[model samples]
Target: PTVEELYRNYGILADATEQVGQHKDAYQVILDGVKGGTKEKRLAAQFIPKFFKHFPELADSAINAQLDLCEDEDVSIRRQAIKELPQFATGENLPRVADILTQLLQTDDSAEFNLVNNALLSIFKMDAKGTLGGLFSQILQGEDIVRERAIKFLSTKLKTLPDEVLTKEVEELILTESKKVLEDVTGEEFVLFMKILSGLKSLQTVSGRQQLVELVAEQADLEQTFNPSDPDCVDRLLQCTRQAVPLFSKNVHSTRFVTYFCEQVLPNLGTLTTPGLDIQLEVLKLLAEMSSFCGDMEKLETNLRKLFDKLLEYMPLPPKLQFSYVECLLYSFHQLGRKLPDFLTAKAEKLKDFKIRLQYFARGLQVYIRQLRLALQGKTGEALKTEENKIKVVALKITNNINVLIKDLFPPSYKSTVTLSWKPV
Candidate 1:
């Protein structure tokens, strides 16, 4: 096909570009055609990827041209431009391409997977800092949905960071940002923040875990200064506990954390009858998370046994406070013991009385679970529905932990099969 034919016929545009490959003016013809080739536009747009596909050597010289096409009114040409631009992008130029990519992420709602997302990833492989910087810049300054995408983008790059350096940067970022959000929301919103922060893989590494330990250590010292009865103080401790538990990776600093929490936080249990000491519940849950970090059999069961035994001391609580305490115990025991397969279940005799109390707590939960169900059976209201969910969760966790104790229960088959199944239901 002739150069004139290339303007109106996309099929032959690349064909002609190749036909004229040796000609001194051939490259110029392709560029001019792409610039304004067909009034219909797409007929000439095909030349972008094709030109690069054939003379990839020229891509370095064609960066601006590629970006210009990225903004073209024509979709085909615009996509081709994004696909071709990264060929010219090295780590040195990744920032520029990332800015362009963020625009696509911001403006286009479509799933931009093939060329758009692919080219962006190519640039990321060459430059994570620029790419992730642009990503988080969106979270810090972009719209709601856009920021969510930014978090999603930032989450995938956790391992991309060098944890040695990431420990400090991530810790600072979380502490500063967390303080702002602490007063802003809780329940659902607080949970979303946790989900986002957990993606920072630094928290799971040894140094990262140490950083979290130190941060929590500072907050726990407030036990002396913050009046537990102050609602604000209570929420503050509660929020920090929520943040600290899931941020951990492998429990690298768990030994230090156990000391910090057991010494600093556990002593506050005597103050538990007061309302502010609800933070102690979170403290226990944190112990569960920290204890489960132990993989060594020798210490794990002992650590787990102490935490669960301590949990029982708070048992026989009022039915009003019963569910959270029971739910917390149910989970902490299950988590601590589950960290071992059945290895520790066999040796639970060392924790013998607590198991009996835990078993007794199971019957106490049935009363609360039964009361909620009976109330719900005749009730009809949004409040009942919400409370019903709460009860349902309590019942679920009770049964969840009951199974953990089944191995230690007598007449193994009866406890495992015949008697225990439906009451839990």
Candidate 2:
């Protein structure tokens, strides 16, 4: 094909490969076409990735031309360029390709943004380490927008990668690099980093898990003063505590974190009635989740007393009952109940100060169940609204759970007064 034919119809390059290869000007003609007009740029962008292998000497020119078109003012040309960009990702060129795609991710246009992200994922398959290096480098030094976008990308995409692609080396690389950012990242970025680090499959190993738990606990900064009134203060503590909760059984810092929560945070949360944000319930739920790690509830005896008192306040169904409140209360009671028998039995002398109050607590539970059973009488499908019915279902479960606790914790004779007769249909 003639140079004019190559320019007019880039398809000739693919069909007449030997002829196009023999002609020294053939690649240059397409290069000119890219630098020529909008249509030419789009055609050349699509064709270079298809035929550039034949013209090995012109690889830089071809790749550069495609990169230029990716930044072209014509949206169609940019899209075509980005769609074909991944094909340029040989093992040697992966870093550059990945870097360019990572930069492109900052685009405000959602369509173009997805194209860039998809291309980057393709390049990542060619070379995970090299691609990740480019992405992390951009995250480290790129402007705030790109840094946030890149970190979010890794947090969201890493999980989708095949198991083989995320080898032990790759997981470790992610952990080490993410830790560097963890040292200085803002709260949002810190959340994303924690997510990426915590989800690593390698961290399932005993040693790996311990390292991660310690790191999470250290970064959580549990000793920081927690002001429940400030939204950021509440959010940061809640987010960090959530991340640190899973590892509570593993590290000293996490154990200290629990103590801080019980002593400092829980006491102040009762009167912190923030509209539209139930900080107290959220903290209660986390406390419930953390309860299982208590190998020795004796360590948290004072805190448990405060917690039990709070549970009594929370256990009663409110005049305008919220399911979340009820649900969390039940969970807290169930978990706390596991440690209660020991508390009441082994520490009988310690509890002599509180026997009557404890008796009245069961009486309140018995009365709460009687009221709930009456309210739920003959209520099911379509008879009650969806929201009200869900509450009833969970409430019955709550009643049964409390009955068992009352039986197990108290004397056999005590069952008659405390064991309320509520059954699930």
Candidate 3:
């Protein structure tokens, strides 16, 4: 059949599937046509499964035919075949899909990158257990995109894979490819690499964890430079530090890196500090997040206290800077609430003025309460009741504090006007 004749058949099949309750018949007709070997008949095959639930029996045959088309000298037909694989070949023909992907990965042709990428992505959605070992082996052997995708795919699987298998595979891959992945790539690719590494670190087993700890220790020994002019550099460093926090704290718990971060990363944040309150606010926000990840809270507290003491030397400046300082103080107090109860109590006692300290304390309580309410709103099932109780406690605390504070601040006359007013008959 001619190309025009084939296009016409596809239109008919698509229309039949779209009409009232004719989907099954439309699929069967298209399937028959695809097996009939006429060009137009085969063209209609691509759209068959899309309009109906997939049939495992037909899926393999259809994918094999499509793979043949993918290799056809006709570029448009090959591209169309590549696009069709996801709809039918994804679940059943995974090994075949990987084979096609391996071919695409090895090819240097730029035109095939999209096809390769799509195939790899489809393979990613499958039970990748059997295939991943070989894929990781190839990945470490110098295929950049393949290595990157493998890392990303492994990151997603980390939570689900058996601890032993995940640790072994991830450690082996990282040990073999860490140098290659860390080299030279920039822009979005570098960000992608960092994120995947973070995910992998989150999944590492005890020994794998130790290895990453040592790697981070080595990284700490390197003389790192921060450029104030480059926000990208700052952001990347922030992400790396953020991801590294959990890994370092959980496995490595390295005093060296934590000390390095305080000495290096914290000081460089000053570059982000500017005349704008908003910029200072953002810097403080990043610091707050970064602080949460620190493994040794006691050590971090000592370091941060020293840093804040130094910051206070410059503090009583302009109004905007003053506000920034207050914001940082509030965030620091919040951090203290999580790490050191004694620190919070001691600082609270030192505030001298009762009402001012109460106001700051109230603001922090309200922030926690708001977060609890937001969390409770999305919960269901067994967790729903537990979350509800948490919300109730937070609400009661907030309400009681507000009532006490208001009554204390206002005299009887003011309180009567605000709360005790009533209409007399």
Query: Against the hidden reference, what TM-scores do the models get?
Result: 0.50, 0.81, 0.45
lDDT of each: 0.53, 0.69, 0.49
In Å, residue 351's CA in model 1 sits off its true spot by 21
The local distance difference test score of model 1 is: 0.53
Candidate 2 lDDT over residue span 1-425, tens digit each: 23355555466565575687875465677776676676567677777777677777888888998888889998888988899887888748888888888988899988898898888888877788888998999998888888988998998988888888888898889988888877887777877887888788887666665677666656667667767676666767678778766555533224455566677777786545557966677786676566545444445677766666555554442133343443444444445455454555665563544455445555666777788788877876676667776667567666655555545444322222221112223
Put down candidate 1 lDDT per residue, 346-411, tens digits, no spaces.
Answer: 655654565566566666656765665665565455655585565664555555555445444342
Give candidate 2 misplaced runs (Cα > 4 Å).
Answer: 1-4, 7-12, 15-21, 228-231, 246-254, 271-273, 295-353, 382-385, 411-425
For model 3, which pairs clash? 6-40
| Model 3 lowest lDDT segment of ten | 416-425
Model 2, CA-based lDDT: 0.69
**TM-score, candidate number 1:** 0.50
Q: Write the per-residue lDDT of candidate 3 for residues 146-185, one digit (tens) a residue.
A: 6665555444444554445545455456445544645545
- Model 3, position 360, has a per-residue lDDT of 55
Model 3 score (lDDT): 0.49
Best prediction by lDDT: 2
